[PDB]
Amino acid sequence: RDLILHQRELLKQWTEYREKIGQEMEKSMNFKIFDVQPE
């Protein structure tokens, strides 16, 4: 079990989780997610 492939996989699954929530927040209250306070 390649730690490096395990890491690429955690990164992938994180980005999946965030896009999922991203969709469900757009079609819901029209809100766009971010990781830093926007302006």
Place this chain on the structure above:
Amino acid sequence: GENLYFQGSHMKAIKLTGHERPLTQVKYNKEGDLLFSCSKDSSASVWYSLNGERLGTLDGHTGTIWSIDVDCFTKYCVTGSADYSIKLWDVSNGQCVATWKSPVPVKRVEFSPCGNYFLAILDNVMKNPGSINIYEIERDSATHELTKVSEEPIHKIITHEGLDAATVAGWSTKGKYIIAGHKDGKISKYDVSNNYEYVDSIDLHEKSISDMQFSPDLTYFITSSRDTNSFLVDVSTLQVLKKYETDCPLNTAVITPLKEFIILGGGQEFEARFYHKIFEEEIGRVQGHFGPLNTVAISPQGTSYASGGEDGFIRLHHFEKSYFDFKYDVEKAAEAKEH
């Protein structure tokens, strides 16, 4: 002999002295240019985050201030105190402009994302079972200035059947839910639009939840406990995404903007620990306190953080180049394989 490093520091810290007593809470405002703090003293402090200079103090309470928040306009801050009161203050001049009374100590206050409401945690004491009270502030549309307050909360969320009393709480995105942490290590969720009705809850920790702080966008959050663990948890389903295991009892935790880290702090009667948020691994330890860390906060731009200790000190940190360049090799591959 002298300690030498391959690269530049991760951060520079300065020490703020003001409080003669153990810190209870630090908090940045929205633009991240101000830091608010409270401690076991009866006055709170306001600092410039750029150079640590004290702008002024908030005087009026008669005991420990357990908690302090600042609204999104940086017009008012709110404090809750062992003296059985809540106070609203004008930040520009330090004046108390509203007070509410409680029959019990108030352990935590927090504004809703849009500034019109705040919540307050009322401790359980004797036959009082504890509650989360929600107060409304009516604002002038133009100046953001206060126009009306009522003496009563508009809703009291009484400790719910089969939960111990709440210790921490906050608002999810656009104030649609309130998430609460409890003395039995549970978490629960209340639907704001449907009269603050219970939705769901979960076991999570073995001891009392000691802090809970949200992500930049309020869609997930991080908890910490003196059982030495910390959890990342998603608002919408309350599922656990990540667990951070330490050998240290935890008083405080935050999610960093901009970098994918977590900061944890605590201690036994002293160093903040950074973890990678996704890989769940310790990436560093930042020394400087003389006793346990009681509170940590991070600026909303992710360019500094502050920690307050049992020693009475606030340490303010500005992140340097090696911090913003900190990357796993896989993350380096992710970034470069974009453009």
